């Protein structure tokens, strides 16, 4: 299996790199070798390794975007995906006020990008990071934010209702966005959004454009079982979400459905 080997070579050489970006680069590398479309279809039928929503979402969006201009199409598509994060930070970091109390979920490079863009604009704020422990990743987020020279406090996992009254805004990076405006993320997003709604705090979602999946879960069981695995995945209602921060602009949760209707899956 050379596709999984190239995926591991593109994902393990840079630990600050996303997985769906490396998957679309693997699809483009198969498109470099019609026979190229057949090889890309073979490896995308053979890429059933990662259980993330963003990987399969980017694979489906590249499978639609591919359908001799396919290589240059994937080239500027990966150019837009690579230049997405700077537009994410530049459109999102303007909402953080001075002296605010930041609430943050587990480790993701997107919220780290928007916090380093926020401290790049001369802003002072304290960040409360939930530990989020099926595995210690919120500690890794607090360690990577302590190197950023910002005041961070490692918060216990069952204290998001304890610290909600003092955290004025709740900014959480999501790993998958369904059509209505809800998000698929790590399991502690639902309780944080419900405690933010009960305390009237604005719940912000910071995710890119390739995480737009065409699914519609009603309950916590209606998310697919291949993305669940002690679950790793919850679901947040779109009524619990104030705004989204994509590269197309700062969007209300009803705009993702507009983009997916104009895109047609």
């Amino acid at each position: 299996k050379e596709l999984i080997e190239y995926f591991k070579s593109q994902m393990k050489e840079d630990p600050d790199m996303a997985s769906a970006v490396a998957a679309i680069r693997t699809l483009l590398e198969f498109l470099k070798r019609g026979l190229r479309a057949n090889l890309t279809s073979a490896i995308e039928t053979l890429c059933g390794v990662d259980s993330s929503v963003a990987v399969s979402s980017g694979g489906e969006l590249f499978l639609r975007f591919i359908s001799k201009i396919m290589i240059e199409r994937g080239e500027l598509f990966l150019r837009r995906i690579s230049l997405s994060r700077n537009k994410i930070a530049d459109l999102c970091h303007t909402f953080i006020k001075d002296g605010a109390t930041i609430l943050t979920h587990a480790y993701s490079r997107v919220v780290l990008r928007v916090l380093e863009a926020a401290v790049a604009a001369k802003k002072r704020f304290s960040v409360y990071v939930t530990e989020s422990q099926p595995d210690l990743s919120g500690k890794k987020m607090a360690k990577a934010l302590c190197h950023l020279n910002v005041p961070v406090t490692v918060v216990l996992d069952a204290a998001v209702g304890y610290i909600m009254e003092k955290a004025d805004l709740v900014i959480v990076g999501a790993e998958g966005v369904v059509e209505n405006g809800g998000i698929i993320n790590k399991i502690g997003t639902n309780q944080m959004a419900v405690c933010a709604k009960a305390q009237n705090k604005p719940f912000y979602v910071v995710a890119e454009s390739f995480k737009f999946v065409r699914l519609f879960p009603l309950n916590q069981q209606d998310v697919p079982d291949k993305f669940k695995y002690h679950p790793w995945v919850d679901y947040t209602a779109p009524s619990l979400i104030t705004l989204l921060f994509t590269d197309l602009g700062v969007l209300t949760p009803s705009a993702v459905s507009d983009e997916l209707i104009k895109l047609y899956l």
């Binding site: 303007t94 909402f95 006020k97 705004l243 602009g249 700062v250 969007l251 209300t252 009803s254 705009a255 507009d258």
Partner: protein, 318 residues
């Protein structure tokens, strides 16, 4: 040249000092007149030079009164119109100028009949023996009510916006038409809200989230209406719709002198007190049910589409 810069300076100082003119539609008509006068008496080779000129002339009007977003987003609409004309002529000196002339004339034709179309579709939202509650003073909402009362019999609670009692004029102008109005203060809003069936208010600026700023104390009315589950009707034109995000820029509220709240004859206690008078307030889009414009009723989950159809994302900084 001289008359151009003179009228530009007069408009800038008029926006710096106070609210001139009083009607926002009259200020929009003067904004289109200023933009057609600045494009008819100037010289340019490329359309982007005129774009930079309109941006440089609009930055001064934005810094004159930051709470008056009508001139800024009307300048931004005219910028998108000139951009669309350059796009349809790109895929050019006098033809583009005549296209700008006929487009701004069509924009005045569309802008003169905004309140007329709101009063035309006013009938499909008011039934007989209905309790209406409003805040402040706005010509759109009172035109809505005086057209809806031509065939229906109902009641309006004219709640005053009281940093300065301007809603008394709305109550008198409705009671001259016979709407069976009732006058109270800002302190009786939730006390009377258990008998209010619908909330019909105006606004000053529709934001990009669907949020709105309006006359102050209407966030309290929106909270009481969300508590009592009544739908909110926002009768608002399509030139108060702006792409300025709420927490993105500063100077949201407009502060005035504290004389209207606490007078100068209060005494020695004025030294050790801090009296702030915001004449506006912030209303989130989840506290809003329906927007009423001249093209039809729209949702707060639909303001972004009007933002895409009326504004360009490279003009949001201006």
């Amino acid at each position: 040249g001289s008359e151009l810069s003179e009228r530009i300076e007069s408009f800038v100082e008029t926006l710096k000092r106070g609210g001139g003119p009083r009607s926002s539609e009259e200020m929009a008509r003067e904004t289109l007149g200023l933009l057609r006068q600045i494009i008819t008496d100037h010289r340019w080779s490329n359309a982007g030079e005129l774009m930079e000129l309109i941006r440089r002339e609009g930055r001064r009007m934005t810094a004159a009164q930051p709470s008056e977003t009508t001139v800024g987003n009307m300048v931004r609409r005219v910028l998108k119109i000139i951009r669309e004309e350059y796009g349809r002529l790109h895929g050019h000196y006098a033809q583009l100028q005549s296209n700008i002339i006929e487009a701004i004339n069509e924009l005045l034709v569309e802008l003169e009949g905004t309140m007329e179309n709101i009063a035309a579709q006013a009938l499909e939202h008011i039934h007989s023996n209905e309790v209406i509650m409003t805040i402040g003073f706005s010509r759109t909402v009172e035109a809505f009510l005086k057209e809806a009362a031509r065939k229906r019999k109902f009641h309006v609670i004219v709640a005053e916006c009281a940093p300065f009692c301007q809603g008394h004029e709305m109550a008198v102008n409705l009671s001259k038409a016979g709407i069976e109005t009732t006058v109270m203060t800002d302190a009786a809003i939730f006390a009377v809200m258990s008998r209010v069936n619908k909330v019909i208010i105006g606004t000053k600026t529709i934001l990009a989230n669907g949020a709105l700023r309006a006359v102050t104390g209407t966030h309290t009315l929106a909270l009481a209406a969300k508590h009592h589950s009544t739908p909110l009707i926002v009768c608002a034109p399509m030139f108060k719709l702006s792409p300025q995000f709420p927490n993105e820029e500063d100077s949201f509220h407009k502060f005035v002198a504290p004389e209207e709240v606490l007078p100068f004859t209060e005494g020695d206690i004025l030294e050790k007190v801090s009296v702030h008078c915001p004449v506006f307030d912030y209303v989130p889009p989840e506290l809003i049910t329906l927007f009423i414009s001249n093209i039809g009723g729209n949702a707060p989950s639909y303001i972004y589409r009007l933002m895409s159809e009326l504004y360009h994302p490279d003009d949001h900084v201006l």
